[PDB]
Design a protein around this ligand. Structure first.
Ligand SMILES: Nc1ncnc2c1ncn2[C@@H]1O[C@H](COP(=O)(O)O)[C@@H](O)[C@H]1O
Ligand SMILES: Nc1ncnc2c1ncn2[C@@H]1O[C@H](COP(=O)(O)O)[C@@H](O)[C@H]1O
Lengths: 152, 152
């Protein structure tokens, strides 16, 4: 049945972490904070089909923002408006989570609040002194859901 | 727990029909088949935030097509390209289902295949002779999922 599949997936929400279902940083469709929204850029963004596009500055692992395709609704290409202005204006909240976070917990944090996307990071304790947060990718509500309803 | 909530929702996937979770036709964000895609129309479409927009001709209950926001990726507003050309070109498949269809079945039909949106219709047996299919709204995978994971 579907019932049984779903129940089992829900049973395994306890063990599994966000690192197991995440989209790793290299498979992620992202965009540079210095980008200009002109017909071709908005075109690539729309073509990607993703509702949410991480915004990075410098290295891809330095993620300062979140762009939503809806934010392009009122943008005119002829204006060649830089992405910075839109990220300042809407300023969508960025959520981070640890790679060891369990999926039930992630699901609970997804329910309360609007945010369906979280940046997955881990602690890198191998220094070079000061330990730093290392960004590994993104996880979404859809990732967790897909893990629940998938068959096996 | 979340586990228990999910399991119960899955238990009730048996009784519930698509009519119970659907977005009724009057709450639906739709668009006329005669529309022209120029900056303001594409703007409304993008502003709506919906991935999929039913395309109706004449009455809102006559649904000939499905527009996806991705289909606007390469469209230039200055061209004032009519929506008909894009619906002909991409021709996304339209799926229909009966209001009495149970949610487990709907979920199964959603898994196999690409389509996450179905037009919900029922048989209107009160004539006036020939019985006709009456369109009541739309149901999506997200509607069913939301019914699974919601609390109570
Ligand atoms: N910017 C992105 N790059 C790569 N994958 C993504 C991105 N956004 C979402 N996804 C994944 O693509 C799937 C559909 O998500 P979405 O189309 O954004 O609702 C899910 O598995 C997401 O985790
Ligand atoms: N064109 C539309 N008009 C009204 N509601 C919609 C439309 N498309 C999707 N929905 C509903 O809005 C929610 C989010 O769907 P979506 O943003 O399209 O992935 C779900 O409850 C859908 O059933």
């Amino acid at each position: 049945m579907e019932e049984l599949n779903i129940i089992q997936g829900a049973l395994e929400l306890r063990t599994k972490t966000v690192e197991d279902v995440m989209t790793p940083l290299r498979d992620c469709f992202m965009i540079t904070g210095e980008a200009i929204l002109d017909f071709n850029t908005m075109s690539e963004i729309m073509e990607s089909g993703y509702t949410r596009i991480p915004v990075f500055e410098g290295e891809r692992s330095n993620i300062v923002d979140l762009l939503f395709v809806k934010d392009l609704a009122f943008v005119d290409p002829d204006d060649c408006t830089p992405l910075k202005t839109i990220t300042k204006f809407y300023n969508h909240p960025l959520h981070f989570v640890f790679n060891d976070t369990k999926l039930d917990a992630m699901l609970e944090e997804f329910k309360k609040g609007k945010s369906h996307l979280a940046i997955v990071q881990r602690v890198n304790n191998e220094g070079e002194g000061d330990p730093f947060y290392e960004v590994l990718g993104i996880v979404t509500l859809e990732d967790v859901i897909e893990e629940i309803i998938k068959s096996e």
